[PDB]
Design a protein around this ligand. Structure first.
Ligand SMILES: CCOc1ccc([C@@H](C)N)cc1
Length: 152
């Protein structure tokens, strides 16, 4: 049947919000009140891939945009990018591996591991207005835990 998707926002464990701030750019910053309209709304699709109770393969598209988070090698490093797709063909259940994240529930938080690059995670910095990047450890100064808010 059709791929199933939910609208949602994400916040890092320091309660920073994600924003489209530049052509293909996601950054994280502290937001509250009127400025919260600026946050990115995701369409989280539940896609094909290896699955367990606490590890669920998803794709993260921007709501009603043909843009997806994806993991590719750039200048020889696993990186996080926003990638445009053919809007006639997306979302789909069999998303290509660069678009797949394992959504992992640990201690009431979520982590998003790259399916393509094991043990590389969607991450945010301590500091305000830095890239949303792919980080090669769920351990240190960088933030790899999030909460999800469900949106209408
Ligand atoms: C989701 C990707 O967001 C990015 C934000 C910033 C940058 C640098 C290159 N300006 C790269 C990606």
């Amino acid at each position: 049947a059709p791929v199933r998707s939910l609208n949602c926002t994400l916040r890092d464990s320091q309660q920073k919000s994600l924003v489209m701030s530049g052509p293909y750019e996601l950054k994280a910053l502290h937001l509250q009140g009127q400025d919260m309209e600026q946050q990115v709304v995701f369409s989280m699709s539940f896609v094909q891939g290896e699955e367990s109770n606490d590890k669920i393969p998803v794709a993260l598209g921007l709501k009603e945009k043909n843009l997806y988070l994806s993991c590719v090698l750039k200048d020889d490093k696993p990186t996080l990018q926003l990638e445009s797709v053919d809007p006639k063909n997306y979302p789909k259940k069999k998303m290509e591996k660069r678009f797949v994240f394992n959504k992992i529930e640990i201690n009431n938080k979520l982590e998003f591991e790259s399916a393509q690059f094991p043990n590389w995670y969607i991450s945010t910095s301590q500091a305000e207005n830095m890239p949303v990047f792919l980080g090669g450890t769920k351990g240190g100064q960088d933030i790899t835990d999030f909460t999800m808010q469900f949106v209408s």
